[PDB]
Design an enzyme around this catalytic site. Sequence first.
Site, PDB file in Angstrom:
ATOM      1  N   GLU B  48       0.817  -1.152   0.034  1.00 45.29           N
ATOM      2  CA  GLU B  48       0.166  -0.080  -0.130  1.00 45.29           C
ATOM      3  C   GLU B  48       0.879   1.128  -0.052  1.00 45.29           C
ATOM      4  OE1 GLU B  48      -3.212  -0.769  -0.279  1.00 45.29           O
ATOM      5  OE2 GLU B  48      -3.846   1.251  -0.670  1.00 45.29           O
ATOM      6  N   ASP B  59      -5.111  10.247   8.669  1.00 45.79           N
ATOM      7  CA  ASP B  59      -4.022   9.840   9.018  1.00 45.79           C
ATOM      8  C   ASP B  59      -3.331  10.540  10.561  1.00 45.79           C
ATOM      9  OD1 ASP B  59      -2.669   7.799   7.417  1.00 45.79           O
ATOM     10  OD2 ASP B  59      -2.941   9.517   5.861  1.00 45.79           O
ATOM     11  N   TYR B 174     -11.173  -3.875   2.856  1.00 44.25           N
ATOM     12  CA  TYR B 174     -10.117  -3.018   3.730  1.00 44.25           C
ATOM     13  C   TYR B 174     -11.061  -3.381   5.255  1.00 44.25           C
ATOM     14  CZ  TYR B 174      -6.744  -0.387   6.222  1.00 44.25           C
ATOM     15  OH  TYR B 174      -5.495   0.046   6.877  1.00 44.25           O
TER      16      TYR B 174
HETATM   17  O1  F9F Z   1      -0.770   0.908  10.708  1.00 42.83           O
HETATM   18  P1  F9F Z   1      -1.565   2.110  10.640  1.00 42.83           P
HETATM   19  O2  F9F Z   1      -2.320   2.470  12.044  1.00 42.83           O
HETATM   20  O3  F9F Z   1      -0.486   3.433  10.455  1.00 42.83           O
HETATM   21  O4  F9F Z   1      -2.506   2.242   9.636  1.00 42.83           O
HETATM   22  C1  F9F Z   1      -2.185   1.909   8.092  1.00 42.83           C
HETATM   23  C2  F9F Z   1      -3.373   2.488   7.105  1.00 42.83           C
HETATM   24  N1  F9F Z   1      -2.461   2.598   5.867  1.00 42.83           N
HETATM   25  S1  F9F Z   1      -3.761   2.491   4.764  1.00 42.83           S
HETATM   26  O5  F9F Z   1      -3.063   3.016   3.529  1.00 42.83           O
HETATM   27  O6  F9F Z   1      -3.811   0.941   4.660  1.00 42.83           O
HETATM   28  C3  F9F Z   1      -5.259   3.358   5.150  1.00 42.83           C
HETATM   29  C4  F9F Z   1      -6.253   2.865   4.752  1.00 42.83           C
HETATM   30  C5  F9F Z   1      -7.527   3.512   4.947  1.00 42.83           C
HETATM   31  C6  F9F Z   1      -7.263   5.200   5.422  1.00 42.83           C
HETATM   32  O7  F9F Z   1      -8.489   5.780   5.689  1.00 42.83           O
HETATM   33  C7  F9F Z   1      -9.792   5.308   5.552  1.00 42.83           C
HETATM   34  F1  F9F Z   1      -9.897   4.167   6.356  1.00 42.83           F
HETATM   35  F2  F9F Z   1     -10.686   6.349   5.832  1.00 42.83           F
HETATM   36  F3  F9F Z   1      -9.827   4.988   4.316  1.00 42.83           F
HETATM   37  C8  F9F Z   1      -6.284   5.425   5.683  1.00 42.83           C
HETATM   38  C9  F9F Z   1      -4.819   4.821   5.484  1.00 42.83           C
END
Ligand code: F9F
Lengths: 393, 267
Positions: B48, B59, B174
Site C-alpha cells: 500500500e 492519518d 479493507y
Molecule cells: O498501521 P496504521 O495504523 O498506520 O494504519 C495503516 C493504514 N494505511 S492505509 O494506507 O492502509 C489506509 C487505509 C485507509 C485509510 O483511511 C480510511 F480508512 F478512511 F480509508 C487510511 C490509511
Amino acid sequence: TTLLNPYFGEFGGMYVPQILMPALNQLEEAFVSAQKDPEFQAQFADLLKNYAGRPTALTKCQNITAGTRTTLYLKREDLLHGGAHKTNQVLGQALLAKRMGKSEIIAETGAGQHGVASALASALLGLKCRIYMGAKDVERQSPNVFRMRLMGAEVIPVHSGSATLKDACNEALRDWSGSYETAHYMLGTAAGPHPYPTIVREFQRMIGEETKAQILDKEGRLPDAVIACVGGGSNAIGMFADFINDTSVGLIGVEPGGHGIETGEHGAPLKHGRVGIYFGMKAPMMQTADGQIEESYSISAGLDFPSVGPQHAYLNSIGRADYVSITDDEALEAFKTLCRHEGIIPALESSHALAHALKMMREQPEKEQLLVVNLSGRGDKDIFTVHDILKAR
Amino acid sequence: ERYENLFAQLNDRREGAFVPFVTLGDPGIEQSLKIIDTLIDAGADALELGVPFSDPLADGPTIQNANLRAFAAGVTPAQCFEMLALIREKHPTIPIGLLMYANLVFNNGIDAFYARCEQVGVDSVLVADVPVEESAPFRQAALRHNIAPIFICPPNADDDLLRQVASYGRGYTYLLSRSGVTGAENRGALPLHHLIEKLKEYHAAPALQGFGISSPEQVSAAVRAGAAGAISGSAIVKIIEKNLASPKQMLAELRSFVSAMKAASRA
Ligand SMILES: O=P(O)(O)OCCNS(=O)(=O)c1ccc(OC(F)(F)F)cc1
Ligand SMILES: C=C(/N=C/c1c(COP(=O)(O)O)cnc(C)c1O)C(=O)O
Ligand SMILES: c1ccc2[nH]cnc2c1
Ligand SMILES: c1ccc2[nH]cnc2c1
Ligand SMILES: [Cs+]
Ligand SMILES: [Cs+]
C-alpha cells in the site's frame, strides 16, 4: 441514503471516511426530528431571546453616509451574547447534541468567536468542551483564548500547517473520527459535509428574517442589497436565506483579499479558486496545479480559510448572489471609520463587509440605494492587532 | 488480477498476506525506492503506497510526518507515478495499491487519474475520504481502467453497507480494526468475526485488517480470525522516522520487522 439533499447543484456532499457516515446520518435524523418538535423549538427560542438577547438591533448609520444617496443599516449581531452571530447556531447544535445523548463537544475556532460560543453553550447546558485553534490565531485573537479557558473549555493549540483555521479544522475532524460515539462535532460554519451546511443555515436564518421585518418597519420596503463577509459562509447565509426568493434584493458576499488577490495571499476561493474535495465537501478551493490544498491568508483570523460553503458556490454559479473581495487595508479603513464616526468597534471580519458597502457608496455617491451590512461581531478581540498596526504606521 | 493471483497462491499455501504501507518519496525518492525493495525482499505480499497530500485527514501524526518529509524532498504526484513505473518494472507480479485522498484523484479529472494508474501498472486505489455513498464516479472509472476500487468495512458496519462493499469493491476489502486515524500506538480490536463471515457470505473481495496493527501477534490474530491478511503502516514509518540519520540501519530494521510480520502471517 439521506433524508435531505446533500448537494447545492454540483457542490456539497459527504466526503468523509466511511467510519463517520453513521454519525452524519444520526445528526441529520436528529435535526429533521428536532425541526418538527415544538418543545425543541420552544427551548431554542427561549435561549435565543432570554439568554442570547435576540432580536438584535438594526442600526441606521447616518454619519458615514453623509452627502451621498446611500442609506446604510447595520444588523447588530455584535450585540449577541458572546459578541458574534456564532452564538445563534451553537445553541441549536448544543441542544441537538443533548438530544442525541452526547456529553462532549469538539469545536474548531479561528477568530475564537465560535470557540467562545461553544464554551459558553457547553457551560450552560452541561457539556465537556474541547476546542482546537491554530497557534497563530491563539496569538492574534488572544482575548478569546482567555474567555474560553475561564468558561472551562480545553483549548488545544495546533502548530501544524499554517497554524490557522484550516489546521484547527483538520485536527477537530481527526479527533471526531475516533470520538464520535461520545462527542458531537460542533462545526462552526455553513461548510463541511452534509448535513452541516443545511443545519447551520437553518439555525442562522433568524438574522435575515429579523432584518426583513425590521427594514419593512423602518423603510416600508426591502433593501436594495444585503452585504455580508464570507469565511465559511454562516453569517452570510443566515442573512441571505430569507431574501433568496425576493428577487429584487441583491445578495453580496465579501471574501478576504488579504494582501491583494495578485499576491496569492488571500482567502477568496469562490472567485479565485477551483472546485475540489476537502473538509468533507465538494466546493471551490485554493489549490495548487497538482491539487494540494493551499494555505490562505487574511488579517482576519475568522476569514482565513481556503474554501467556502457549498450553498454560496451554488448561489454564485446561478448568479443569485455576487461575490467580491476586500483587502486587509480596505478592511482596516472601514474598522477605523466605524469606530470614529458611529462609535461601534466591529470585528475585522465584519469590517470586510462594511468596507465593500462604503465602496458601493463612495464609487457612486448619487446612486439611491438602501443597504444592510451584517455586522457579524464586535472587535474587542482585534483591538490589540489593530493598535499594533496603526502604531507601526 | 494481481490480487486474484496472490490470494489464490496464499490460499494454496494456507498463508495470510502481510501488506506494509509507506509514503512514496519519504524521506526521498532514492531512499523510498530502496525502502520498497527491502519490504519486498523481506517478504511483503503486496504494497500500500501513499501519494503525499497536504491535508491527510485519516492519518495520525506518524504518517502526517511522512507526508511532510516527502514534501520537504519536493515530491509531487507526477514523481510518484515515475516511482511506480520503476517499482513495477522490477517487480512484475506484486499487487500495488495506492492510498489516495479525493482531491488528488478529482484534480483535473477522475477518468484521467485512473488511466494513469492503469498505464503505470497499479492494481488498486483506496480513496480514503470517499464513502460508498459518494463513490459512483470513482468506482466506475476504476473498473473502466481495470483498477480495483477498495472500500472500507468499519467495525459497526450494518448489513446494507456490507452488501454495498461486497458488490462495489474488488481486489481486497479493507477491514478497519477501530475508529480513529492511523497510528501504531492505538492498537484496536480483533477482526469482528461476524463481519468477516458476512463478507464471505456476500462474496466480497478477501479482507485485509488495518489500523493499529504493529506487532506479529496482531497479524497472527487477524489470520486466525479468518481475515486474508493484515496491513501495517505507522509501525513501518516509525522505523523510517527513527533512522533518518542512518539509512543502512533503517533498511536492516525494516527487513527484520517485515520478516517477523510476514512469519506471523503463516500461523
Ligand atoms: O498501521 P496504521 O495504523 O498506520 O494504519 C495503516 C493504514 N494505511 S492505509 O494506507 O492502509 C489506509 C487505509 C485507509 C485509510 O483511511 C480510511 F480508512 F478512511 F480509508 C487510511 C490509511
Ligand atoms: C472562524 C471564526 N469566526 C468567523 C467569523 C466570521 C466568518 O465566518 P462565517 O463565514 O461562517 O460567518 C464572521 N464574523 C465573525 C465575527 C467571525 O468570528 C471563529 O470564530 O472560529
Ligand atoms: C438526494 C437528493 C435529493 C433528496 N431529497 C431528499 N433526500 C434526497 C437525497
Ligand atoms: C470557516 C471554516 C471553519 C469555521 N469554523 C467556524 N467558522 C469557520 C469559518
Ligand atoms: Cs440619504
Ligand atoms: Cs474564505
